Structures are given as C-alpha cells and as structure tokens.
Ligand binder design. Structure first.
Ligand SMILES: *[C@@H]1O[C@H](CO)[C@@H](O[C@@H]2O[C@H](CO)[C@@H](O[C@@H]3O[C@H](CO[C@H]4O[C@H](CO[C@H]5O[C@H](CO)[C@@H](O)[C@H](O)[C@@H]5O)[C@@H](O)[C@H](O[C@H]5O[C@H](CO)[C@@H](O)[C@H](O)[C@@H]5O[C@H]5O[C@H](CO)[C@@H](O)[C@H](O)[C@@H]5O)[C@@H]4O)[C@@H](O)[C@H](O[C@H]4O[C@H](CO)[C@@H](O)[C@H](O)[C@@H]4O[C@H]4O[C@H](CO)[C@@H](O)[C@H](O)[C@@H]4O[C@H]4O[C@H](CO)[C@@H](O)[C@H](O)[C@@H]4O)[C@@H]3O)[C@H](O)[C@H]2NC(C)=O)[C@H](O)[C@H]1NC(C)=O
Ligand SMILES: *[C@@H]1O[C@H](CO)[C@@H](O[C@@H]2O[C@H](CO)[C@@H](O[C@@H]3O[C@H](CO[C@H]4O[C@H](CO[C@H]5O[C@H](CO)[C@@H](O)[C@H](O)[C@@H]5O)[C@@H](O)[C@H](O[C@H]5O[C@H](CO)[C@@H](O)[C@H](O)[C@@H]5O[C@H]5O[C@H](CO)[C@@H](O)[C@H](O)[C@@H]5O)[C@@H]4O)[C@@H](O)[C@H](O[C@H]4O[C@H](CO)[C@@H](O)[C@H](O)[C@@H]4O[C@H]4O[C@H](CO)[C@@H](O)[C@H](O)[C@@H]4O[C@H]4O[C@H](CO)[C@@H](O)[C@H](O)[C@@H]4O)[C@@H]3O)[C@H](O)[C@H]2NC(C)=O)[C@H](O)[C@H]1NC(C)=O
Ligand SMILES: *[C@@H]1O[C@H](CO)[C@@H](O[C@@H]2O[C@H](CO)[C@@H](O[C@@H]3O[C@H](CO[C@H]4O[C@H](CO[C@H]5O[C@H](CO)[C@@H](O)[C@H](O)[C@@H]5O)[C@@H](O)[C@H](O[C@H]5O[C@H](CO)[C@@H](O)[C@H](O)[C@@H]5O[C@H]5O[C@H](CO)[C@@H](O)[C@H](O)[C@@H]5O)[C@@H]4O)[C@@H](O)[C@H](O[C@H]4O[C@H](CO)[C@@H](O)[C@H](O)[C@@H]4O[C@H]4O[C@H](CO)[C@@H](O)[C@H](O)[C@@H]4O[C@H]4O[C@H](CO)[C@@H](O)[C@H](O)[C@@H]4O)[C@@H]3O)[C@H](O)[C@H]2NC(C)=O)[C@H](O)[C@H]1NC(C)=O
Ligand SMILES: *[C@@H]1O[C@H](CO)[C@@H](O[C@@H]2O[C@H](CO)[C@@H](O[C@@H]3O[C@H](CO[C@H]4O[C@H](CO[C@H]5O[C@H](CO)[C@@H](O)[C@H](O)[C@@H]5O)[C@@H](O)[C@H](O[C@H]5O[C@H](CO)[C@@H](O)[C@H](O)[C@@H]5O[C@H]5O[C@H](CO)[C@@H](O)[C@H](O)[C@@H]5O)[C@@H]4O)[C@@H](O)[C@H](O[C@H]4O[C@H](CO)[C@@H](O)[C@H](O)[C@@H]4O[C@H]4O[C@H](CO)[C@@H](O)[C@H](O)[C@@H]4O[C@H]4O[C@H](CO)[C@@H](O)[C@H](O)[C@@H]4O)[C@@H]3O)[C@H](O)[C@H]2NC(C)=O)[C@H](O)[C@H]1NC(C)=O
Ligand SMILES: *[C@@H]1O[C@H](CO)[C@@H](O)[C@H](O)[C@H]1NC(C)=O
Ligand SMILES: [Ca+2]
Ligand SMILES: [Ca+2]
Ligand SMILES: [Ca+2]
Ligand SMILES: [Ca+2]
Lengths: 389, 389, 389, 389
C-alpha cells in the first residue's frame, strides 16, 4: 500500500534551532541497564523516528565496559530504540551486526547496512525489511567503512558512501546505489575531494547532499552532491573559510573549494552542514583542538563563496562540555511544504578525555530548525563522572 | 477515519469518588529503575489512558537523584506510561524535552507541548502526532510556563494557558488556541483574575473550565472559562469562602469573586475544581500550612456564591501524609450520557519536607466520580523513607 | 466485529493433566524486579491467555517486601502479564486497584473487578474494556470480597459471587450478573450452602459451576450452580466423602450434601473442582493440616454421591512442597468440540511457614486436561529460601 | 488470509557465510537480567525471525544459576526473543514448559513442542497458535526427547523426529507428522542409521533433510530424508570421511554410508549439514576432543561419496573458543528464487569446562550463506569469565 518517498520539497527557512530529542543515557546508565554505545544517529520511518547507534555489547555499569574505547569488535551491533529513551538491553532492537553502519527508510521499508570483519577482510551486509539481501566484500582490504548516520532515498533509490583504504592518504571511496537492498550500481568517487570519511547526508528536491570528513590533510569539509535519479555525483570542499572539521586551524579569510585547507593532518570528526544558498548553516565544535562544544553558524553561500563568514549562530553545547560526532537527518514524512532540517550531536563521555573510568560511551542531543528566532539553551550530557568511580 | 472529539455532554452527578489509578512509584523505585519525576498528570486517548509527568533524567536509586528538588534543567522531559504502572526507564515514552508541559488528544491525534531553555530565553515546542509543528518564544523573558496537566479539545481546537513573567506580581498570561499543533489565535488574559499559574482544565458542553493558582496575593483560586468555538474567555475567582490554595488563611464567611483573598503571598499549589452548580466539588490540601492531606468538598455554587460552604466531602489523603499538585482530567471517549469527573493528586516524597534523602520525587493517586455514595479510604504514597538511607 | 461467547460445548474427557504454564517467579525474583503477589489466577482472551494476581506494590528483593503477609493495603492492585513469564514491574499491566478481584472476557471485551477500602467501608469498581463502568458499596460493612479467580460469561452475561460479612459465621453472599460492566441483577444466595468464600468457576453448555470455600464449619466444599440465561442459581455441598478443603478431617465413608462436614472451623483454602458425572475430578492439598502438596482425584459423581471415592489420580505438587490457593479456568476460544478443563495452583513462599524471610509471595503452576493417560511429574516452586537471607 | 508455506525452491549457491545474528548474552548478563539458557536455535515466522532456547528459570547473576549444568528440571521452558537481543526476563516469551523442544511456523501459525516429566514418565505437549492441541506419552520410558532446533513444514505438514530409549545403545526413534498441531501419522525409524539424536533439519523442493547425532558408536552423522507429502522417510549416514561429530577420530580416507564410523562411543554433539551435491557444506567443531571451535567445510557430494574431502572452508569460531550445539534454519518467507542456508552455533560458557563459576549458559552466533566469496572473521562468545567470580 505504501509508496516510495520522493524528494519533492526544499528545506524550510532556518532561523534558529529547537530541541528535538535528548536521551540522558549516561545519567540514566549510572543506575540502569543502558548499553555502551558510540557513533549514534537519528532516522525516521513514515510513522516513527528512532535513535540509532553502535552498541558495544555490554552495559555501562557492566564489567565488560572496560576497554570500550576500542572501535571494532565482534560484540558491536547497530541498534535502534525509541526517540529520547536511552539505549537499554530491553528497548534496543538490533538492526544488524558490525562496527560501521548506515540505515534509511525508503517509504516502504528500511534498509540497514552493517560492516563486520577483521581490518583486512571486512564485508558489508545489506538488510532490507529486516532480512539480508546483498553483501559487499572489502575492495581495498583496509577497514571497509561507511557513513555512521542515515542514508536518504528517492523513488526507492538509496545512495550510500563507503571508503576502504588508508585513513591518512588516498583511499578508495565508492558511492553505491541500492533499491530494496539490491545493488543497482556503484561508482568510484570523482571530483576534487581528496579524502572522504563518515558522510552526513540529507535530501531535498535538488538532490542528495553529503558533508564528509577529510581525515588526511583537510580541515575544511568535503562535499558529495548526488543525483539519485541519474545515479551520478560530484565532489568538492566547502569553500568558506569558516572551517568545520576538528581539530582545525583558526579561520582564515580565504577558504579552499577544490583542495584541503592545511594545518592539521591525520585526524577529524564526523560532522554535517545544510548547504542552501542564503539558508546555509554549518555545524562545528567550538574548540579548534578537541571534541568540545558545538555551534551552528549561518554562513551564506558557504559551499561556493571562499570569503563567506557567519551572520548568525546558535550555541548547542558549551565549550566546557564534551561533544563528538554530528550528523544530519530529516523527517521526510512530516506534513507541510518544506523539509525541516535536523541534526544530532554525540556527547562522548569517558575515554580518552575522562580516563578515571575505563569505558567510552555517549549520549545524544538532537535539534530541528524553526522559522522563529528562538532563544538558545546549551545541552550537555549531564552525567557526573565521579559517580562511576 | 477518526473524527475530532466534540464536548457534547454534561458532567455526571458526583456523589462520591472511587479509586481509578495508583502507581506506588516510590515504593517500587526503592528496588527498580523508576525515574525521578514531579508535576504528574493523567490524560486519555480514545483507546487508552496514561500517566504523564516531568522526568528528571535519572532513577531514584541512581546517584543523579541528588539535587532533584530543582525544577528546571536540560535533563527533564515529558514522559507518559501505562496507567498505574510506575514510570520506569523501560516503559516511559518521551513526548518532548523540557521542564513545563501540557498534553491532550483531540480525537484524531495527541498534542504535547514542552517548554525548555534558560529563564530569560525559554521556548515552547508544540508536537502533534509525535512531530514538532510550531514553536513559541518567550514574550516576557521570565520562565515561560504552562499548565502541568492536560489540555482539552473541542472540534479540533485545543486551548492552552501560558504565563511568562513574575511569580510574585503582575505577569503576562496568554491563552493559545491550537489545531493540529498550529496556532490559530492567542489572546491576553482578560477578566478579574490578577495572577495565573498552572491551570487545571476540563471540558463539557458548556465550554472549558480552568481552575488555576494565584501565586501573588490570593488564596482563593482564579478561574478561566473558555469558549473553544468563539475562542474567547473570561476570568474571575471562585467566590466561595472555602479557600483552596495552599498555604492559605482559615476559611472566612465571605469569599472574594473578583480579587485575591489576602493573607498569604508569593506561594501556592496547583489544584483544581469541578464547577457545576449544585454538583460543584472543590479539591484542597487538608493543611492550611503545607502540602499535606487532600480532600474533596461539595460546595454548591462555589463559583458564584460568596457565602457557600460544604455539604458533603471525601478524604483522599490523610493530613498525616504528603500530597502535592492536583489536577483534572476526564475520559472524553467513555461511553455513556455524561462525562465522569476525574482527578489526580501528586504524592511528593523527599525534599524539602523529608531531607534525609537528597532527592525529590512523587507517586500518583487518581480518582473518578461515582453516582453511588461509596465508602472512603485514604491513599498515601506508601514508601518508608528510612529504606532509602 | 467480535461476538459474545456462548457456552455451547461440554467438557473434554479428562484422563490426565498436562503442564500448561509455570512462571518460576520466586526463583527469578531472587535477582530480578519481580513484584510480590498472592491470590493468582489465569484467564483467557480470544487471542491470548494471561496470568493474573494481586500485587503488593513492591518487588521481592525490595525492602517494602517486609510485611507482605498482610492481605489488604492501599498498595495492592490486580495485575496481568504474559503466560509463564513472572510478574515484573515491566510486564505487569494493572487492571484495577484493590485487594480482592475477579476478571473475565465476554468475547468482545474484558471485565475486571477490584474491591478496595477499609474493612468497614469497602467498594467494588467494575471495569469493562479498561474503563470504570459501575460501582458497588459494601452491604454488610465487613470486608466485601470476591472470587480471586476468573469469572465466566455466556451471551455477554457474566455472573460473579461476592461475600460481605463474617468469615466465621453467617455472611451475606450475593450473585451479581453483569453485562458490559453494567449490573443487570443481583440476588442473595439460596440453597443449602451455609458459608461461601472465594468461588472458582467454569462454564459449559449446562451452565456455570462454582466450587467455593466454607470458612465457617465445613471441610467439604460448597457448590453454586448458575444459569446465566435465567440469571438464577442453586447451592449445596459436594456430597462425596473425599473432603477437599484445608485444613480438614480425614475422609469418612459418608459425606454431606446439604450441610458442612464438621471437625475444622474458621479456616479453609480457595479450591476448585470439575463436576461432570463420571468425568468428575476434584483438587485438594495432600496434607490435611496445611497448604502443602496438591493432587487431582477422579471421583465419579462426587457432587451427588455421598459414598463416592477416587478411581484415578494425579500428583501435581508433592506434600513436601508448599501449595496455596487453586482455581479453575478454561480457554473458551480454543477450537475443537469440547472445552478443556484447566486449573492453577498458587505455590506460596515465605510467611507464615517460612519465617526466615519477612515477605510472603508465590509462583504459579497450571495444568490442562488430556484425553491421553500421561505420565505425571511434580511441580514445586523451585526457589531456595536460603538465597534470600 | 495466510496460506501454508510450500517448499518450492532449491538452496542458494553457498560461496561463503555472512554474519546474521549474535546476542552477546553472557557479556550482557554479567550486569543485566539475562536468563540462563542452553540448547538454543533460530526460527522464522513470515514477518520476523527470533532466537529460541531452553531457559533454566533463573538469571545468570541470580543465585539459582548454581547447578545449571543439569539438563532436566521443572524450571525449564522453551523461550523465544527478538533476533540478536539476549534472552532476558522481560523479552523472553514462553512457548511451552519443558526440557526438550522444537518449533516451526507453517505459514499460518507456529507449532511448538515441549517435553517434560521424570525420565521414566515424560510427555510431549504440542502447541499450535499458542494453545495446547495434542499430547504424546513416552513410549520407551527413557527420556523422551526431540530435535532442539526448528522443524520444517510443507503444505501444513510439519515432520518432527523424536527418540525415546537408551543414549548408548539401540533406541526407539519415531518420525511424527503434524498439521495444525494434530498428529496425522507417526512411523518408526527405517534405513541404516543405527542411533538418532537431536536432528537438525531444513527443507527445499526435494524434501526435508535432517542431520542428526549418533550418540552410540558413530562419529559420522546419521541423515534422515523425509518426504512430507507421502509422509515417508529413509536414513543413512553421511558417507564422507570428513567426520563431523564431536568427539571423533581423525578423518580417514574412506567413510561409512550405512554404519557408524568407529572410535568414539557414548557421546556426540548436535550438529548439522546442507547436503546438496556440489553445493554441500558440513559444519563441525575444530577440535576432535571437545566442543571448541567451529568451521564450515565445502565437501562435494558428502552424503554419497565415501572418499570426499573439502575444497573450501570458513572458520566460524576459533579452536581457542568454546562452541556447542549447532543447527540449521532458513527464512522460508524471504523473497527471491532460492532458500538461503543459515545456521547457528551455541557458544557454551561455564561448566563443565569453566568450573570456577557454578553455572552453565551460552550465547548465540548465527550465519547465512552468500553467493559472494566474503572475508571471514571469527565469532567468540566474548565474555570474561573472571568477571563472574
Ligand atoms: C537569547 O537567545 C538568542 C537566540 O540564540 C540570543 O541571540 C543570539 O546571540 C548569539 C551570540 O551573540 C548570536 O550568535 C553570534 O552571531 C554572530 C553573527 O551576528 C553578528 O554579526 C552579523 C554579521 O555582521 C557583519 O555582516 C553584516 C551584514 O551581513 C554587517 O551589517 C555587519 O556590519 C558585519 O559586517 C550581524 O548582522 C549581527 O547583527 C544582527 O544580530 C544581532 C544579534 O546577534 C543584533 O543585535 C543586530 O541588531 C542584528 O540584528 C539583525 O539580525 C538578527 C539575526 O542575526 C535578527 O534577529 C534581527 O531582527 C535583525 O534583523 C551580529 O552583529 C556570530 O559572529 C557569532 O559567531 C562568532 O562568535 C562566536 C562566539 O559568540 C564563536 O563561537 C563563533 O565561532 C564565531 O566567532 C568565530 O568565528 C568567526 C568567523 O571566522 C571569527 O571571526 C571569530 O573571531 C571567531 O573565531 C574564533 O573562534 C572560532 C571558534 O572557536 C575558531 O574556530 C576561530 O579559529 C577563532 O579562534 C555568533 O554565532 C546569535 O546569532 C543571536 N541570535 C539572534 C536571533 O539574535 C540572545 O543573546 C539570548 N539572550 C540572552 C539574554 O542570553
Ligand atoms: C464510610 O464512608 C462514608 C463516605 O465517605 C463516610 O461518610 C462521610 O463522612 C465524612 C466525614 O464525616 C463526610 O464529610 C464531611 O461532610 C461535612 C458536610 O456534611 C455535614 O454537613 C451538611 C451540611 O449541613 C448544613 O447544611 C444543611 C443543609 O444543606 C443543614 O441541614 C445543616 O443543618 C447545616 O446547616 C449536612 O447536610 C450533612 O448531613 C448529611 O450527611 C451526614 C453524614 O455526613 C448524615 O449523617 C446526615 O443525616 C445527612 O445525610 C444526608 O446527606 C448525605 C450526604 O451528605 C446522604 O448520603 C444522606 O442519605 C442524607 O441525604 C453533614 O452533617 C463537611 O462539613 C466535612 O468537611 C469539614 O470537616 C472536615 C473534617 O471532617 C474538614 O477537613 C473540612 O475541610 C470541613 O471543615 C473545614 O471547613 C469548614 C468550611 O469552611 C469549616 O466550617 C470547618 O471548621 C473546617 O475548617 C477548618 O479546617 C479546614 C481544613 O483543614 C481549614 O481549611 C479551615 O481554615 C479550618 O481550620 C466533611 O467533608 C462525608 O460527607 C460523608 N459522606 C457520606 C456519603 O455520608 C462514613 O463516615 C464512613 N463510615 C465509617 C464508619 O468510617
Ligand atoms: C507414570 O505416571 C502414571 C500416570 O500418573 C502413574 O500412574 C498413576 O499412579 C497413581 C499413583 O499410584 C494413581 O493415582 C492413585 O489412583 C488411585 C485409584 O486407582 C486405584 O483404585 C481404583 C479404584 O479401585 C476400586 O474401584 C474399582 C472399580 O472402580 C474396583 O475394581 C477396585 O477393586 C476398588 O474397589 C482402581 O480401579 C485402580 O486400578 C487401575 O489403575 C491401576 C494404576 O493406578 C492399574 O494398575 C489397574 O490395572 C487399573 O487400571 C485401569 O485403570 C487405569 C486408570 O485408573 C487405566 O489407565 C488402565 O488402562 C485400566 O483401565 C487403582 O487400583 C487412588 O486411590 C490414589 O489416591 C489415593 O492415594 C494417594 C496416594 O497415592 C492419596 O494422596 C489420595 O488422597 C488417595 O488416598 C487417600 O484418599 C482415599 C479416599 O478417601 C483414602 O481411601 C486413602 O486412605 C487416602 O486417605 C488418606 O490420605 C488423604 C490425603 O492425604 C487424606 O485426605 C485422608 O484423610 C487419609 O489420611 C491415587 O490417586 C494414578 O491413577 C495412576 N494413573 C494411571 C493412568 O495409571 C505411574 O505410576 C507412573 N509410573 C511410574 C513408574 O512412576
Ligand atoms: C580472507 O577471507 C578469506 C575467505 O574466508 C580467506 O580465504 C579462505 O582461507 C581459508 C583458509 O586457508 C580456506 O579454507 C581452507 O580451504 C581448504 C580447501 O581449499 C584448498 O584445497 C582445495 C582443494 O584442493 C584439492 O582439490 C583440487 C580440486 O578440487 C585440486 O586442484 C588440488 O590440487 C587438491 O587436490 C583447493 O582447490 C583450494 O585452492 C583454491 O583456493 C585457494 C584459497 O584457499 C586459492 O589460493 C587457490 O588458487 C584456489 O582458488 C580457487 O578456489 C577458490 C575457492 O576455494 C576461489 O575463491 C578462487 O577464485 C579459485 O577459483 C585450496 O588449496 C581446506 O582444505 C581447509 O580445511 C582444512 O584445513 C583447516 C585449517 O585451515 C582445518 O580446520 C580443516 O578441518 C581442514 O583440514 C582438516 O581436514 C582435512 C580433511 O580430512 C585434513 O586433510 C586435514 O589434515 C585436516 O585434518 C586435521 O584437522 C581436522 C580438524 O581439526 C581433524 O578433524 C582431522 O582429524 C585432522 O586432525 C580450509 O577450509 C578458504 O576456503 C578460503 N576461502 C577463499 C574464498 O579463498 C582468506 O585467507 C582471508 N585473508 C586473509 C589475509 O586472512
Ligand atoms: C553452589 O552450590 C554448592 C553446593 O552444591 C556450594 O558448595 C557452592 O558454594 C555454591 N556456589 C556459590 C557461588 O554459592
Ligand atoms: Ca581533517
Ligand atoms: Ca496563592
Ligand atoms: Ca473450611
Ligand atoms: Ca557420536
């Protein structure tokens, strides 16, 4: 009875951001069976929106939380759970097993992809309506990996960005196009982006826009623009001198559109943007050195204007508080004439920055745009680490 | 397929009150993952009635329960859960994030409103069928706030009372009218009520009646009467000398219809009444000094008769036991020829009255009316505070 | 779309009993949030069968389990939960608040009745499809009380037996007839039963048969036979000298049809029978002194034959193990040409017999009949009380 | 509306195995209410696939976990729970009570069978759509027992293999044929298999193939081939010299088709195979001495070729890690032109191999086939036993 969703609207005008969801997972997990997670995101079905993350296969208070700084193990899985609840043993639904993921609903059913394996022999399994449908073996034998936030579909076609290869040099990035979990096509990355990790994507009538992480030489973010009908793409960098990776140099007065802006090598953080002419907003950590704080900045024409600077902003997380990965999502099934931009911020607690505990986990905060100019709060994780000692 | 509910019945004749629900949350939370809450209420959908409250983002036994006397933080959310279960991490569904709320079902879907932010920059987000639809910024920059119990709808129009401004002097109260989460209209408070907080509302064929709290000078309660078709209102006070705020003076022989009855300033408690001629019943704490005990009193024509006194009553909570906020709700979808009046009482435990623990929480008891003259019990929270030490 | 169920079948031939459900609640509750209960039963809906009991408003490991030998408090409620799971905070659905109950499904919706109040002022609230519909005040001001197992309906009419008055002398027993929760009729007890408590009922094409407890002078069980169409009844005792109350005298050779068989006063236990000519089976504790063991005995024509003795049996619980209340239920919606007799046994743990713990709780075992002659096991609670010390 | 499923497809070509599900139950159960289990399996409904196992009626951290090496007690039950979650008190649905089981969906509803009783008087109860339908008494009075993994249905007919009698000599094996839980037929075992335990079955257009355990003299596995239309069967052994029981001799160069391959008596392990000409894959423990490691081996024509050796393989569990029972299942309702072979491995932890704890439990890993040649990982339980001390 359901039809595939088509991307037929533009973005709503973003004049501020309002609270959407928050799970307080570390606070609650001090005294409840909350799973250790990282790499969270949010994704909507036609009738519900849910939180997602990679479990570590242990609760926070469990003794197996010791060592959860590590990224890849056989005990990780993509889980989903109700919006603004914390991920518990009892409410977390496993989507698939592995240590790197994406997921999206096409209007009829959900596709979830999880990668598992050793570093030199990893494979993706593509699930559609809760069944495995297709599998993809590593092509570069060096940590096949994907977005860590939601994909986006148009008329049943759901593109997904993957990378396999070095994190500190040229790698082999591919864009796959799925329909009902089946591989329609893949293509190698083209354009001027020089390194791609952890793309954060959203869709609108123009196409699908992904803002990624250059882990090699860049502190400006690469952008992949996908046409899901033709199944083709382009890439470049955000031209603006408002640099949005982390760590990063200080903001210059001229950015770089077709190459990495230099100064910080071999590191980064997953992040996102909404690139929409005069309605452009960029997210970034407040700190240039570490994953602390989070702000949204209105930077007109950031994608294309190598002199562009902010004209409005909003603090999301104070610089005194830990942040983490961030990514885009939207509720494509909400009624109205425009798609309301949304995002989440991962609020990382524990190692490496808080090493009196032996675990690493996170909570989630998420916001959506308003056409009002709303007052701002700040949204910390809220747990007192000393309680875990 | 569903239609908006219309208020087409009068109240049933209230000859006594019968037990409806009770969650025993503090008893159970001594040994289970029960969330710390306050400001509870009850609200019905066409097929289910649920408990609601503002979580504090921690369980009672969790170490983060320390400090939960505080009213506003980033860790609060409106939650709902099944009738007479306690609010646990596992059964509590988040309706929205914030520290002041209302919620109601219009017959088709539920509207929930949560306010969040710092005191000088708060904002309401209006959710409808589990999606954000509208946002309202603070207009007086001083703790924008709302009912803390259910709203009521007629033909899709759901009025809600908000206040922004001082709690100890004139403030800016507005009545908003929503349909499908969209703002149809708002108006400033009119009439003779001099201060409005925390309105408790119910609907019937005559219109929507809200009984509120005058926190400034009054120990009689203000009343707002709303016509949800014309989208207009009036206000006054309950005229009766049976005073129903807390703390309060002793009952005189002449009440006040159009001004606060004096003697207690800068305090109050959320409460309620059913104002229906000879079928009028008022709730109040038994104590005139503190939030202890709870009784219902049949006070004919209390709204309009400044000499009216009780002719019948029922003890709900003994004066030896702690009470708290109270509010009205009804199951507008129950079959029959009349709407059965219902209410809840918040049973506050912990601080400030029980300061050997470091938390503040509550449980819920709720009653509905009977046309029988039923025997009365009393309904304490039932937890032994010493067990938490 | 659903129709009321009609009692159109006879009982299946009972040649043995097979295991139906068992929750292991005390074993599991040693280390999980299992509610303290007593007075359990089983009842079916058209699409599911569930366990029921009266919660005590605390978990077993919780400190509020101390004192749960007591029968009546404001913290009790009728709960239901999935067959063979234990009653936990998370899976227990509250049907209504109180300390004596019954419940049954009529084919369209479920009626649940809970009595609450002080001993001299108790009241029943009748819920239908999860809403309160009717209320009944105490008529004798002495612990209004009901079946503690399921009722039975025919063409929408659901009879329920209540008692109010002394437990150690003549009392005021009434049979109420409900439809959609509304009172159609009530009548005073007639016939030769001299005292009635805690009736256990089942239905078949002949009518509704209830086996009760004479707490005053009898150790034979009273029987109430109800015609749910005419809404009339008769009463007598089981004539057989196989005595089935507890405590009780030893079995004589002549029973009593119209008066209590003497020797034990002012005590008893809830129990049951299936009275069906040559297909008659009686349940009883094995011990004549205490609530220990449980057996089923095939006693042809027990109702009417004052010389009848057993011709077959089955041990359910060894005499070395604690038992408790027992009662009848059937899955009236199972396909086939006959109704399969079922029963449960409450396996009481803790006080008064095991007083090294400070609580009283139970688990459940339940059996249904087979037309095979199946091998027998025995079914203890299975918890080691020493683990709770 | 639903129709019975018909076995109309062949197996997909198996070129490797991909991860399907993993529950990490022992890791999570270190700090959560995870039930002690053993004898797990997986089985699909038309709209969901679930994990199954025999509970021990206690959590792992509960004190009643002491003694759970024992196989048969009144506290065991067949439970099911969501794929890749662990079996908790809160998510485990009881299918039936007992200590040996099978279960399968016929396309319309699920049949579950549980055996309970003492060793000399056990009985099976056959449940269909969650109601008991048929019962089978022991025929040899010596531990009536069944598959411990899913059955398979065709056009509503679901065969199930049972054994009653000695585990160390000739026994009485029967194949029962059920439809809607009713016994259509049973027959005694025929063919050249000399002892049958714990059959693991799958279906395809050819019929139903079961790979079993010869506990008496054989270290090759018996095979039962069932025609579910004619309701007849044959039996033999896997002819290949790649021996797949445990413990077992080393692989010779000539296997045995019609008799046990000798060297190890009175022991074995439940296991499985997919027997499909050149697409044949066998599972086995890596160790020849103990239940450690697990591998899949491609052995062309293993069923019929007494010289056949492996031509491809995949490690599932390293020899350094504990394994356990293994069995077959498939998602018969997945779209496509072939049935994708799947299996699970029970990862046993605790006694007897790890006797510093007093319990025995397990977790689950499960895989399905791919037509790609995917990289391999290994999939241990992942718990650190020292944490439980
Ligand atoms: C209640 O809640 C509300 C709502 O949230 C809150 O108001 C909000 O306050 C915040 C904080 O003040 C504000 O965010 C800031 O916005 C700044 C941009 O706005 C200002 O500049 C624009 C542009 O000016 C240029 O261009 C104009 C033409 O376009 C030209 O005319 C100018 O002359 C100039 O050339 C200007 O237009 C703005 O003026 C409007 O807004 C004012 C209010 O902000 C108002 O008073 C004015 O009248 C005017 O009003 C109109 O517009 C508003 C909407 O904007 C409408 O609502 C009105 O109706 C009118 O139409 C402002 O003057 C932005 O620059 C800020 O970001 C910088 O600073 C923050 C710290 O605060 C950093 O974290 C940022 O990263 C950033 O600074 C870094 O980056 C830049 C870029 O490279 C560098 O230059 C900096 O040096 C700095 O770099 C360093 O740090 C970074 C990070 O660590 C590092 O990476 C670097 O390497 C380096 O180390 C900030 O985002 C927000 O917009 C505002 N919202 C609203 C709606 O008002 C209230 O305060 C709350 N109330 C209370 C009591 O609390
Ligand atoms: C089993 O369970 C049942 C059911 O619950 C229970 O019965 C219930 O008992 C309670 C407690 O007794 C009872 O509640 C009280 O009701 C009082 C009102 O009823 C009495 O007065 C009326 C009115 O009399 C005037 O008006 C008449 C004309 O309208 C006139 O004729 C009179 O002469 C007089 O002028 C009177 O009509 C009543 O009489 C009927 O009811 C009697 C039973 O109550 C019965 O015996 C009579 O025959 C007659 O029966 C008819 O009516 C009933 C229904 O009412 C029908 O069922 C019958 O069939 C007949 O038709 C009564 O004489 C009410 O005043 C009480 O409230 C005051 O007291 C409580 C403490 O008890 C306080 O907490 C209250 O706040 C309140 O007192 C404060 O406030 C007032 C007002 O300002 C002050 O004047 C006081 O001084 C006091 O103020 C102080 O304290 C407050 C609070 O701290 C503070 O704020 C102040 O500042 C100050 O410090 C109370 O509500 C209930 O109605 C009754 N229900 C039923 C159905 O009977 C049984 O007892 C239980 N059984 C057992 C064994 O336990
Ligand atoms: C595997 O699992 C199976 C299945 O469960 C199991 O077999 C089962 O074993 C149990 C235990 O032995 C058995 O239960 C007992 O059944 C007794 C009744 O059966 C016997 O008597 C009848 C009637 O005999 C009279 O009437 C006949 C005509 O009707 C007449 O011909 C006789 O001469 C006589 O006058 C008799 O017909 C039976 O014979 C049949 O069954 C035999 C097997 O039991 C078989 O060998 C025979 O060949 C014959 O077979 C036919 O019938 C069976 C079905 O029954 C069919 O299956 C066959 O195909 C044939 O058609 C038996 O001889 C019953 O009396 C027992 O109950 C008393 O004893 C128990 C203790 O065991 C007490 O707890 C009870 O309360 C009760 O005793 C108390 O009460 C009585 C009554 O007042 C007093 O007289 C007593 O003194 C005593 O009172 C004291 O204690 C109480 C309680 O504390 C106290 O309250 C008092 O005050 C006082 O202090 C018992 O129920 C069961 O039926 C049987 N089932 C089957 C299907 O066989 C196997 O053993 C298991 N295998 C293994 C290896 O474990
Ligand atoms: C990334 O991930 C991939 C994917 O998993 C992984 O590659 C995989 O590696 C594993 C491990 O190496 C490999 O599994 C092994 O497979 C062995 C079989 O393959 C080899 O033999 C065949 C058959 O050769 C005979 O027959 C031919 C004709 O049929 C003839 O031409 C020959 O001359 C010969 O007569 C041969 O065809 C294979 O060659 C192909 O594959 C090679 C790669 O494996 C490739 O290099 C070749 O070019 C050729 O490629 C073609 O085929 C592949 C698919 O196979 C296609 O993908 C290509 O495109 C080409 O078309 C191989 O030479 C199998 O024997 C192994 O099992 C034995 O050893 C393991 C230990 O490793 C034991 O645990 C097993 O039990 C077993 O050994 C026991 O049992 C046997 C049988 O009785 C005894 O003889 C042994 O002595 C031993 O017995 C002892 O132990 C047991 C157990 O304890 C005990 O019970 C006994 O009693 C006794 O004590 C093993 O299964 C897997 O297939 C391979 N997969 C793929 C797709 O390549 C990569 O390594 C990973 N990468 C990294 C970097 O990690
Ligand atoms: C388990 O039970 C045995 C008795 O059989 C006892 O010796 C042992 O101490 C128990 N283990 C624990 C951890 O209590
Ligand atoms: Ca970078
Ligand atoms: Ca006041
Ligand atoms: Ca008695
Ligand atoms: Ca063997």
């Amino acid at each position: 009875r359901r039809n595939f969703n088509n991307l037929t609207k533009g973005l709503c005008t973003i004049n501020s951001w309002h609270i959407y969801g928050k799970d307080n997972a570390v606070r609650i997990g001090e005294s409840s069976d909350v799973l250790v997670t990282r790499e969270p995101y949010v994704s909507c079905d036609p009738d519900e929106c849910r939180f997602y993350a990679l479990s570590q296969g242990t609760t926070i208070r469990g003794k197996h939380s010791n060592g959860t700084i590590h990224d890849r193990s056989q005990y990780r899985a993509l889980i989903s759970w109700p919006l603004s609840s914390p991920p518990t043993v009892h409410n977390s639904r496993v989507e698939c097993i592995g240590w790197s993921s994406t997921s999206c609903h096409d209007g009829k059913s959900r596709m979830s992809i999880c990668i598992s394996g050793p570093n030199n022999n990893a494979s993706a399994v593509v699930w559609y309506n809760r069944r495995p449908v297709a599998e993809i073996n590593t092509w570069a034998r060096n940590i096949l990996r994907t977005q860590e936030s939601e994909c986006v579909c148009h008329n049943g076609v759901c593109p997904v960005v993957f990378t396999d290869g070095s994190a500190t040099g040229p790698a082999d990035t591919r864009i796959y196009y799925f329909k009902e979990g089946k591989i329609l096509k893949w293509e190698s990355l083209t354009g001027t982006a020089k390194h791609i990790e952890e793309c954060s994507c959203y869709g609108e009538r123009t196409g699908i826009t992904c803002t990624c992480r250059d882990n090699w030489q860049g502190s400006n973010r690469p952008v992949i623009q996908i046409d899901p009908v033709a199944m083709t793409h382009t890439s470049q960098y955000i031209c603006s001198p408002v640099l949005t990776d982390n760590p990063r140099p200080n903001d210059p007065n001229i950015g770089k559109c077709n190459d990495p802006y230099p100064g910080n090598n071999n590191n980064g953080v997953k992040g996102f943007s909404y690139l929409d002419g005069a309605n452009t907003w960029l997210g970034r950590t407040i700190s240039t050195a570490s994953r602390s704080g989070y702000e949204m900045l209105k930077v007109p024409n950031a994608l294309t204007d190598d002199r562009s600077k902010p004209i409005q902003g909003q603090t999301i997380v104070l610089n005194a508080d830990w942040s983490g990965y961030s990514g885009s999502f939207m509720d494509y099934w909400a009624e109205g004439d425009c798609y309301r931009a949304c995002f989440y911020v991962e609020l990382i607690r524990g190692r490496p920055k808080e090493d009196k505990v032996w675990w690493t986990s996170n909570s989630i905060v998420s916001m959506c745009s308003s056409t009002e100019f709303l007052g701002q709060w700040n949204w910390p994780d809220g747990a007192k680490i000393e309680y875990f000692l």
